[PDB]
Paper text:
To reveal the molecular basis for the high affinity binding of the Omicron BA.2 and BA.1 spike trimer to mouse [name], we determined their complex structures. The high affinity binding of mACE2 to both BA.2 and BA.1 spike trimers can be rationalized with the extensive interactions between mACE2 and the RBDs from both Omicron strains. Particularly, Q493R forms three hydrogen bonds with N31 and Q34, and a salt bridge with E35 of mACE2; Q498R forms a salt bridge with D38, and a hydrogen bond with Q42 of mACE2; while N501Y forms extensive π-π stacking interactions with H353 of mACE2. The interactions of the RBDs from both Omicron strains with mACE2 cannot be completely satisfied in the hypothetical model of the WT [name]-mACE2 complex, which are consistent with our binding assays that the WT [name] cannot bind to mACE2. Collectively, our results indicate that the three mutations of Q493R, Q498R, and N501Y in the Omicron RBDs are essential for mACE2 binding. We determined the structures of spike trimers from both BA.1 and BA.2 in complex with mouse [name], and our structures elucidated that the three residue mutations Q493R, Q498R, and N501Y are essential for mACE2 binding, suggesting their importance in infections.
The trimeric spike protein is a major membrane surface glycoprotein of [name]-[name]-2 that mediates the binding to the host receptor [name] and subsequent viral entry into cells. The matured spike protein contains two subunits: an [name]-binding S1 subunit and a membrane-fusion S2 subunit. Extensive structures of the spike trimer reveal the open and closed conformations for the three RBDs within the spike trimer, where the open “up” [name] conformation is prerequisite for [name] binding. Upon [name] binding, the spike trimer undergoes conformational changes to expose the FP motif of the S2 subunit to initiate membrane fusion that allows the release of the viral genome into host cells.
Author numbering:
A (entry chain A): 335 to 528
B (entry chain D): 19 to 134, 140 to 615
The structure:
């Protein structure tokens, strides 16, 4: 069967600025197990419905896992705008798949702050659909050259998420999983059980 | 219009860093207040030093951007609030002397003692000034406190005034009094501008309409004190300062047991019925949340219920035991209060929940704009809720008062009289103190005429006379906490005005058909939506627009205040018809 146990139950999810991607090629899939926890505020499907996922078959499915703030989960959708949508992870205007996310305060939060998750704050231009930029050069905002030293009008692009147990409810960590059901004029492989 | 994206990015980064730094500092301060230990104190001091350094460094760079070149209103507002340095304008030695004098005056005040008997300020002396009813007992205390504190603080205040003036002049301000007035300054379109010099005109015009009600209350209280101070009260003179039930005469609440309108019909106190029903700490906050939901405001987060300290800890932890609504940022709201089973505790819990709701309102605004429109809206937003919760009908519906209870006319008069003694009594005092402080900073009252003009104003505006002659060596103003410590005092007048303004504005939205003092905004979503229309703005828009969003008017108006005490006003007019309204300024007890 498909290795769904590795996408969701990973001991540590990737940062939004370095979201990882996994694909399915041969084995069977099963969508009825995507129940990480009872309240699933993020189960939005695009182009398809959750009830017919089993009957439909696709060539390959891309699963992108990343963590973002609760307030930024709404930005993971086609046609949205925001620091996460433009500079970290952009979805096409006409995208077919499923967006899944759940609360992860107990895991990705610590009293002293879990600075292991980061995000891109500034970028010279918006990211294209399904683009991943991991550069670390300084962001030049003025008419002066960024000589590798941070300061006035020369800020560091990446910043850290200070997840804490009492970090409110909107700023808490949310393990996101975006499933892209790519289908083309190719042999379909990702079918449902029979 | 050029060089704006740079300021935008600067503000973005500043917010990104300042939110986390403020969360850390607030969490340290919370851990210290809820657990007083040297370790928590050191952590709080280090966090505060880090936050202060970061904010000062970011503000020094904020001044590099010429504000007049920015065109976006929100970015301009964000830059304006951060460009103001304040104390950093002074040199190293000037700040040296300023901080030295300030903290030395604070220590002389806190560590002040009177010796004839010997009682400290908070314990003993305040209890005397509140409960004591003997002439000499209060006279010796009121004289000794001043002669011991103000005489020592006088030589320090003469330097502190000029130091603060130099500080303000470096910030392009005229005087320190003008610096404090900057809190009400507003910028915007033609119909939303508010000149900084116009605050005095509004305060004076607003006070001219409160004098009749205050004059009648004074005439009433004066006669009621003759039964306890026969030879120390005059039928046409001013009231002695030491007989105001307070060390400074700020609050007349301590005079209610003597000036009660009707003694045979007391006020309401649901403490007995509250405790008999098993009302614990959380039960009160549950009712407060239910009330705040009945108006259409958001619910309380589970984080608040989990992190808030709503009961005195029995683990032996040392707590400051003072009510304060905490907004640690990032959605971490908490309430700190040693909740007990009483009605005063109920009202304070309602006030703190209103503060928390207000803080939650403008959480969507930028970090630099997550503050109230002015220093008067904050306390008023909670005072209006406390007033709405004190309605007898609300207590009857909640289940504390029996449904068979029928409100009476005398109880309402007593409640209004107590409110006036606690509200109407402090309005002239605050205005007089603020005007005196302004005239001192502006240099209109020479140092050789401080006490003379101070007492002349006390006699004219407030109608209070001193029991003994005070020369220029005494410093009665510095004897007050808010005068020794640098704290603006006009906030209370504006708060008292804005709370009644909001009460009269929301009652119209709730479609009330009765007296304003019995208005209950509960179970009225239109009232909350109209109020939330302003709480969400915070400091994003000028306070004029924030006030218009609720009251409809763009400036202060005391008509709702007079409407609130309209029954008490007529009652006093009918009762004060047995005396000469007013007071003479040429009479003094030391005229032996
Ligand atoms: C209240 O104050 C005490 C003062 O001792 C704190 O106790 C110390 O906490 C550090 C870190 O928690 C420990 O490494 C020490 O061993 C503690 N000493 C004791 C007596 O255990 C305590 O943490 C503070 N507590 C609360 C509840 O804030
Ligand atoms: C992860 O493992 C748990 C069992 O501990 C399982 O219930 C859950 O469904 C797995 N994750 C997914 C979505 O496959
Ligand atoms: C508020 O609404 C509830 C539910 O209708 C009702 O039980 C209660 O009597 C109302 N109370 C007031 C203050 O009108
Ligand atoms: Zn308070």
């Amino acid at each position: 069967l498909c290795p769904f146990d590795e996408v969701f139950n990973a001991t540590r999810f990737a940062s939004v600025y370095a979201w990882n991607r996994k694909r399915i090629s041969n084995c069977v899939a099963d969508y009825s197990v995507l129940y990480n926890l009872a309240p699933f505020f993020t189960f939005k499907c695009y182009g398809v419905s959750p009830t017919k996922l089993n009957d439909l078959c696709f060539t390959n499915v891309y699963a992108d896992s990343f963590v973002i703030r609760g307030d930024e989960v709404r930005q993971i959708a086609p046609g949205q705008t925001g620091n996460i949508a433009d500079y970290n992870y952009k979805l096409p205007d006409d995208f077919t798949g499923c967006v899944i996310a759940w609360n992860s305060n107990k895991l990705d939060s610590k009293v002293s702050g879990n600075y292991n998750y980061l995000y891109r704050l500034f970028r010279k231009s918006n990211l294209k659909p399904f683009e991943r930029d991991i550069s670390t050069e300084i962001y030049q905002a003025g008419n002066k050259p960024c000589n590798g030293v941070a300061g006035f009008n020369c800020y560091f692009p990446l910043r850290s998420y200070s997840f804490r147990p009492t970090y409110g409810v909107g700023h808490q960590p949310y393990r996101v999983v975006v499933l892209s059901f790519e289908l083309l004029h190719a042999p379909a492989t990702v079918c449902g059980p029979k | 219009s050029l060089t704006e994206e740079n300021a935008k990015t600067f503000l973005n980064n500043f917010n990104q860093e300042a939110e986390d730094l403020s969360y850390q500092s607030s969490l340290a301060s919370w851990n210290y207040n809820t657990n007083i230990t040297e370790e928590n104190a050191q952590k709080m001091s280090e966090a505060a030093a880090k936050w202060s350094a970061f904010y000062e460094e970011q503000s020094k760079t904020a001044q590099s951007f010429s504000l007049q070149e920015i065109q976006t209103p929100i970015i301009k507002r964000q830059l304006q609030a951060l460009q103001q340095s304040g104390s950093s304008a002074l040199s190293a030695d000037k700040n040296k002397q300023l901080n030295t004098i300030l903290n030395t005056m604070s220590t002389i005040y806190s560590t002040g003692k009177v010796c004839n008997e010997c009682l400290l300020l908070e314990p003993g002396l305040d209890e005397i000034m509140a409960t004591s009813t003997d002439y000499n007992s209060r006279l010796w205390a009121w004289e000794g406190w001043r002669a011991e504190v103000g005489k020592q603080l006088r030589p320090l205040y003469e330097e502190y005034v000029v130091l603060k003036n130099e500080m303000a002049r470096a910030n392009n301000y005229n005087d320190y009094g003008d610096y404090w007035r900057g809190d009400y300054e507003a910028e915007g379109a033609d119909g939303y501008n508010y000149n900084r010099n116009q605050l005095i005109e509004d305060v004076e015009r607003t006070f001219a309409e409160i004098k009749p009600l205050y004059e009648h209350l004074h005439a009433y209280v004066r006669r009621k004190l003759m039964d306890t101070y026969p030879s120390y009260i005059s039928p046409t003179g001013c009231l002695p300062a030491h007989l105001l039930g307070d060390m400074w005469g700020r609050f007349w609440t301590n005079l209610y047991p003597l000036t009660v309108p009707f003694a045979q019909k007391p006020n309401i106190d649901v403490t007995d019925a509250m405790m008999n029903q098993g009302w614990d700490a959380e039960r009160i906050f549950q009712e407060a949340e239910k009330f705040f939901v009945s108006v259409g405001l958001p619910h309380m987060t589970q984080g608040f219920w989990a992190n808030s300290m709503l009961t005195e800890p029995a683990d032996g932890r040392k707590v400051v035991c003072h009510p304060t609504a905490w907004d640690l940022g990032h959605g971490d709201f908490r309430i700190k209060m040693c909740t007990k089973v009483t009605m005063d505790n109920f009202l304070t819990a309602h006030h703190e929940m209103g503060h928390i709701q207000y803080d939650m309102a403008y959480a969507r605004q930028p970090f630099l704009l997550r503050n109230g429109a002015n220093e008067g809206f904050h306390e008023a937003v909670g005072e209006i809720m406390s007033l709405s919760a004190a309605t007898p009908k609300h207590l009857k519906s909640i289940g504390l008062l029996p449904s068979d209870f029928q409100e009476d006319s005398e109880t309402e008069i007593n409640f209004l009289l107590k409110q006036a003694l606690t509200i109407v009594g402090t309005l002239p005092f605050t205005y007089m103190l603020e005007k005196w402080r302004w005239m001192v900073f502006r240099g209109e009252i020479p140092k050789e005429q401080w006490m003379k003009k101070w007492w002349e104003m006390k006699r004219e505006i407030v109608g209070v006379v001193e029991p003994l002659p005070h020369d220029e060596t005494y410093c009665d103003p510095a004897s007050l906490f808010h005068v020794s410590n640098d704290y603006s005092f006009i906030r209370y007048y504006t708060r008292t005005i804005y709370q009644f303004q909001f009460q009269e504005a929301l009652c119209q939205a709730a479609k009330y058909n009765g007296s304003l003092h019995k208005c209950d905004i509960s179970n009225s979503t239109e009232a909350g939506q109209k109020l939330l229309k302003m709480l969400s703005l915070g400091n994003s828009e000028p306070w004029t627009k924030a006030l218009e969003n609720v009251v409809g008017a763009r400036n202060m108006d005391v008509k709702p205040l007079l409407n609130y005490f309209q029954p008490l006003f007529d009652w006093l007019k009918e009762q004060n018809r047995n005396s000469f309204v007013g007071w003479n300024t040429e009479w003094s007890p030391y005229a032996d």
